[PDB]
Amino acid sequence: LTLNFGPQHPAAHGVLRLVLELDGETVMRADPHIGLLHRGTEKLIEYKTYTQALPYFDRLDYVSMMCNEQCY
Amino acid sequence: IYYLTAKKVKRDEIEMRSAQNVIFPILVAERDREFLRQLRRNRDEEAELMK
Amino acid sequence: MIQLMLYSLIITTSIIFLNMIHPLALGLTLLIQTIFVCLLTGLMTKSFWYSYILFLIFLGGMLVLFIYVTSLASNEMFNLSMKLTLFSSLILIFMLILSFIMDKTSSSLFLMNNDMQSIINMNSYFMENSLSLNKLYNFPTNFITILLMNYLLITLIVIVKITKL
Amino acid sequence: QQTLPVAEVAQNLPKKGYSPFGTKQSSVAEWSLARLDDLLNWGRKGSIWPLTFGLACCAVEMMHIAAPRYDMDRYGVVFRASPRQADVIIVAGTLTNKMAPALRKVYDQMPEPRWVISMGSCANGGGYYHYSYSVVRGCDRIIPVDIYVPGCPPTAEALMYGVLQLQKKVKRMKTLQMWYRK
Amino acid sequence: KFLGINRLTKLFQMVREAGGLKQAYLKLYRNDDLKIGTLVGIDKYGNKYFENPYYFYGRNRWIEFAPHV
Amino acid sequence: MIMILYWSLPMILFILGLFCFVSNRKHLLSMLLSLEFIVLMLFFMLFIYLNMLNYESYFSMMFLTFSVCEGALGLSILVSMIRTHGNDYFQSFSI
Amino acid sequence: MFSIIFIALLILLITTIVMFLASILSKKALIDREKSSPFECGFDPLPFSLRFFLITIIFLIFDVEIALILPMIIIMKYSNIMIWTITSIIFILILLIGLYHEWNQ
Amino acid sequence: MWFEILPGAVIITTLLSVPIYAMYGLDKLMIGNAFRRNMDERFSRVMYQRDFRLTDNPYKMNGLEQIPDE
Amino acid sequence: MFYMEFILSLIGSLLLIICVLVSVAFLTLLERKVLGYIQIRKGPNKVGLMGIPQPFCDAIKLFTKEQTYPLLSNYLSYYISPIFSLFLSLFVWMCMPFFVKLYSFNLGGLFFLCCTSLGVYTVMVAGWSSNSNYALLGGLRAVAQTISYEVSLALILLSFIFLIGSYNMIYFFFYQVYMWFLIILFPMALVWVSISLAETNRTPFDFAEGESELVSGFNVEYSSGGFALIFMAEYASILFMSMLFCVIFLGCDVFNLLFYMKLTFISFVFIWVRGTLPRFRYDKLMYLAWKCFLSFSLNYLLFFIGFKILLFSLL
Amino acid sequence: EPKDIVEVPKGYVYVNNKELSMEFADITDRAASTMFFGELLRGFAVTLAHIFKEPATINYPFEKGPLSPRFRGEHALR
Ligand code: SF4
Incomplete structure (x- = not known):
């Protein structure tokens, strides 16, 4: 059974697409498909200055805000 | 406590069964008289129908 | 009267069981036949124990295997036809009005119920579903139900071997 | 705009009432259809079930109306995971190019009436990735949107203000009056 | 009090401060909770x-x- | 007569289920479901027999146990060909 | 039992009438290609499992076994006590030994 | 505060108390006897049959006034 | 045969059905309210007055939305699952112990086991006809857990029938005239709570119909009236399990208002375990249903076989 | 007090490092907690104690939550 834990699914974080092959309840294979929330951050940093690219890191890992700003 | 409750339920159903055994033979005699009478009318009806 | 209604319903479900071919639809026809068979065997008997036993064993216990296998066997849905529904309804109304125009005393079954027995019958007043089930748990017929439980365990041993797990 | 009415002026104003249509309908059939539409809109605004569609950071505020301080459950609002059982889809996050057919299919499998709330600057207008190669310039090009909540992470009072504005839109829905005038 | 009987007369004085029982009914129907408080401000x-x-x-x-x- | 008015219908539906069991227009799952249809009709006729006697109805769960073990045996025979004959063997019209 | 048929047919008739009136009261919109599609999360799209089938078979064997444990509450006041106790203790003990043996193997 | 649950629960206590209590009124209205006759044992069914044979209402009493003077 | 028996049986059954349905609506209100109070948050409010007509807001909305279908051509098999689900949930209530006679069910436990054995059938037609792999997985998982605790439930109720000596539900009243069965059967009380949260899909046994591992097990394609009938059927099953806990363990007390207060309290307990416990797994639930509960069932059935033999000599 | 499987250093803290106890008192305590749902009873009691707590629902829009003078909202031209 091929199955999609797609972006609608709540155990996924809203953009994960887990294409998983199932023999019964067991998971024989699980390929994560990502890039559904790819926003082209590294292409957009180079067209802006340092203080303009500082708010990108707040939106990168968005449960760790001040740590990302601290790292940048 | 369940043993005492089951003893109470047992004596209640034994009281009901003894009352049933009292009521029973009068109703048996009444059924006997009606059964013999109905057998007589059934034999008479079968005799007059099959002439 | 209601015995003739169950006769008509069993006839109608049997002829549509003969007509249809989709395997889950035959499974649905079996599960709705089992209810009418349970009720109709309940009309002849003193009490409804064996209808309940047939119900738990056959419908809720065994036919769920058939429903699961026939559900995973067929990918497609039912193709409902209004012609077969109309023919089943027409033969059902015809058989109910045929039971209306027929004497129900001659068509009733000769098997005695709990109230069709004599009033002076001592055995009927004792306890509901007591004397019929008595021979299951008395000498010398208890060896058959011990052999039946052993037979069910041996059946499970057979089934594990033949499916190969 | 209009100046909000001064209390000297507003004391002379009568009460608005619950019904936006008013009870001054002429025909008895038109009045009956107006009250039936009022009851239908009250039932629809009394419980809207939004869908668990959280794409990006905005959704971290979306759970913050689930949170005990703001408490969306006393507004008829409770999350449903399946798109069939849900009324509303809240686009809360960044719709990308790989995300577009998934959002369109999830919206199309939702049953009508379908109100859509765009939560956040990535949901409406593209926002902070508006000039990106793989970000759709707002979700208005794909899914038709009824309420647009403005803030980059909308505060949760502002998202719930969008929810109350959607409830006012649902209360203003005219279906049976339009059927009588069709 | 230990049991909480003295909150019932707080509810009663909430009803009397609302302006009666009908005014308390339409205050509870409109404002989702019934509360007492010092009147701080009135707008224009x-x-x-x-x-x-x-x-x-x-x-x-x-x-x-x-x-x- | 007695056979025409009483217990005629289980015979007719038993022959109908037997003809559904052996017809070439059906498949193996239809054979098994028609087999349990004649199991139900056999229970009907056996209960009509067993209720002429008063207190021998306890045999009805013996035949039930044997025929239910037969049905589970037939299903476990039929699904044991899934890993060998594939999932398309349920549509086989011939053996 | 004849009243049970009447009340069950009335419950079935009331539920079908309520669902028919719900289908009338449901808002009829234009039917679509994607709206009729089966729901897979997001992007659009099982074999036979033997373990669940033997779960159903174990359920069936234990169900037919329970159908022989069912009568003996009534028979306890109307049978031989020694025979009834021997059959009940043997019945549940062989069931427990079989369950523990299938657990260990 | 926490007493707002009791609007949603006590009503549940009332409605499910309806289908017996109304019958405890209603059997006192059209029958006159508050309890319908129990049909579990066969002897109760036979004696109920005897009452419905004796009077057209089986819950109507045939007391000692039925007995003729002798 | 006297016709007022039929008339009053019909009136009492229809009144029972109506009151059960309105109690289902108010049970959904109670669950949304106190399930909020399980956490810090408030329950429903702001609709009508103090959130009371919120289930009527649910009922107006669910009976108006577009009845969508999992496929466009043939969908009559999609209809037959909520009809039979609500039919069984309103039909199982006929074996309630009524002291004023409504139906003389001398075998009520077998009737309850029959309706529970159809619960698997309505959820199996719920799973298959919805044409989705999530729907088939949820239907197979629900059929798996319900037939896994069907055997356990049959053995537990079969152990309880040994105490009263018959299958008549009103015989639970006469054996509870001095004390409740909660005192004598407290591990059976915990096991029966674990049983009653398994046949009806609640949070402790929610791998069948959860929102985490599946989006929805068998309500995934059901909406706009079918979901309303399924939801009402499941909450009627919750009400029936609360009543059946209150008859067996707590004293039947059918007339007293304290019985219905305890029924609302056991519904409160059902919503109390709704907010507390996490969800079991498939392997751990096969371990629970077939080894622990089965071994406890057979062992304590042996205990009551010995106890009912010991009291039979003494009485 | 169970013994340590791994010796805990000065700058670190170890979780699930306790040995499983083998004396009969602790085995009977763990057995009674397994059989009679003691830890589930503690979880149920902790859950039920939060019904009696004050709700934190702030009743929007009659009462609005705290803000700050630095708060960023609608841009405006002074
Ligand atoms: S609008 Fe702002 S907060 Fe929302 S997803 Fe985009 S960057 Fe994040």
Whole structure:
């Protein structure tokens, strides 16, 4: 059974697409498909200055805000 | 406590069964008289129908 | 009267069981036949124990295997036809009005119920579903139900071997 | 705009009432259809079930109306995971190019009436990735949107203000009056 | 009190301070909770701002809007 | 007569289920479901027999146990060909 | 039992009438290609499992076994006590030994 | 505060108390006897049959006034 | 045969059905309210007055939305699952112990086991006809857990029938005239709570119909009236399990208002375990249903076989 | 007090490092907690104690939550 834990699914974080092959309840294979929330951050940093690219890191890992700003 | 409750339920159903055994033979005699009478009318009806 | 209604319903479900071919639809026809068979065997008997036993064993216990296998066997849905529904309804109304125009005393079954027995019958007043089930748990017929439980365990041993797990 | 009415002026104003249509309908059939539409809109605004569609950071505020301080459950609002059982889809996050057919299919499998709330600057207008190669310039090009909540992470009072504005839109829905005038 | 009987007369004086039982009914129907508080402000638009530090933070200040709407 | 008016219908439906069991227009799952249809009709006729006697109805769960073990045996025979004959063997019209 | 048929047919008739009136009261919109599609999360799209089938078979064997444990509450006041106790203790003990043996193997 | 649950629960206590209590009124209205006759044992069914044979209402009493003077 | 028996049986059954349905609506209100109070948050409010007509807001909305279908051509098999689900949930209530006679069910436990054995059938037609792999997985998982605790439930109720000596539900009243069965059967009380949260899909046994591992097990394609009938059927099953806990363990007390207060309290307990416990797994639930509960069932059935033999000599 | 499987250093803290106890008192305590749902009873009691707590629902829009003077909202031209 091929199955999609797609972006609608709540155990996924809203953009994960887990294409998983199932023999019964067991998971024989699980390929994560990502890039559904790819926003082209590294292409957009180079067209802006340092203080303009500082708010990108707040939106990168968005449960760790001040740590990302601290790292940048 | 369940043993005492089951003893109470047992004596209640034994009281009901003894009352049933009292009521029973009068109703048996009444059924006997009606059964013999109905057998007589059934034999008479079968005799007059099959002439 | 209601015995003739169950006769008509069993006839109608049997002829549509003969007509249809989709395997889950035959499974649905079996599960709705089992209810009418349970009720109709309940009309002849003193009490409804064996209808309940047939119900738990056959419908809720065994036919769920058939429903699961026939559900995973067929990918497609039912193709409902209004012609077969109309023919089943027409033969059902015809058989109910045929039971209306027929004497129900001659068509009733000769098997005695709990109230069709004599009033002076001592055995009927004792306890509901007591004397019929008595021979299951008395000498010398208890060896058959011990052999039946052993037979069910041996059946499970057979089934594990033949499916190969 | 209009100046909000001064209390000297507003004391002379009568009460608005619950019904936006008013009870001054002429025909008895038109009045009956107006009250039936009022009851239908009250039932629809009394419980809207939004869908668990959280794409990006905005959704971290979306759970913050689930949170005990703001408490969306006393507004008829409770999350449903399946798109069939849900009324509303809240686009809360960044719709990308790989995300577009998934959002369109999830919206199309939702049953009508379908109100859509765009939560956040990535949901409406593209926002902070508006000039990106793989970000759709707002979700208005794909899914038709009824309420647009403005803030980059909308505060949760502002998202719930969008929810109350959607409830006012649902209360203003005219279906049976339009059927009588069709 | 240990049991909480003295909150019933607080509910009763809430009813009397609302203006009766019908006015308390339409206050409970409109404002989702019944509260007492010191009247702090009245706008030119007719709103009424009440404050009472008995409640916890976030609930100690409330608006009651103008009664023409 | 007695056979025409009483217990005629289980015979007719038993022959109908037997003809559904052996017809070439059906498949193996239809054979098994028609087999349990004649199991139900056999229970009907056996209960009509067993209720002429008063207190011998306890045999009805013996035949039930044997025929239910037959049905589970037939299903476990039929699904044991899934890993060998594939999932398309349920549509086989011939053996 | 004849009243049970009447009340069950009335419950079935009331539920079908309520669902028919719900289908009338449901808002009829234009039917679509994607709206009729089966729901897979997001992007659009099982074999036979033997373990669940033997779960159903174990359920069936234990169900037919329970159908022989069912009568003996009534028979306890109307049978030989020694025979009834021997059959009940043997019945549940062989069931427990079989369950523990299938657990260990 | 926490007493707002009791609007949603006590009503549940009332409604499910309806289908017996109304019958405890209603059997006192059209029958006159508050309890319908129990049909579990066969002897109760036979004696109920005897009552419905004796009077057209089986819950109507045939007391000692039925007995003729002798 | 006297016709007022039929008339009053019909009136009492229809009144029972109506009151059960309105109690289902108010049970959904109670669950949304106190399930909020399980956490810090409030329950429903702001609709009508103090959130009371919120289930009527649910009922107006669910009976108006577009009845969508999992496929466009043939969908009559999609209809037959909520009809039979609500039919069984309103039909199982006929074996309630009524002291004023409504139906003389001398075998009520077998009737309850029959309706529970159809629960698997309505959820199996719920799973298959919805044409989705999530729907088939949820239907197979629900059929798996319900037939896994069907055997356990049959053995537990079969152990309880040994105490009263018959299958008549009103015989639970006469054996509870001095004390409740909660005192004597407290591990059976915990096991029966674990049983009653398994046949009806609640949070402790929610791998069948959860929102985490599946989006929805068998309500995934059901909406706009079918979901309303399924939801009402499941909450009627919750009400039936609360009543059946209150008859067996707590004294039947059918007339007293304290019985219905305890029924609302056991519904409160059902919503109390709704907010507390996490969800079991498939392997751990096969371990629970077939080894622990089965071994406890057979062992304590042996205990009551010995106890009912010991009291039979003494009485 | 169970013994340590791994010796805990000065700058670190170890979780699930306790040995499983083998004396009969601790085995009977763990057995009674397994059989009679003691830890589930503690979880149920902790859950039920939060019904009696004050709700934190701030009743929007009659009462609005705290803000700050630095708060960023609608841009405006002074
Ligand atoms: S609008 Fe702002 S907060 Fe929302 S997803 Fe985009 S960057 Fe994040």
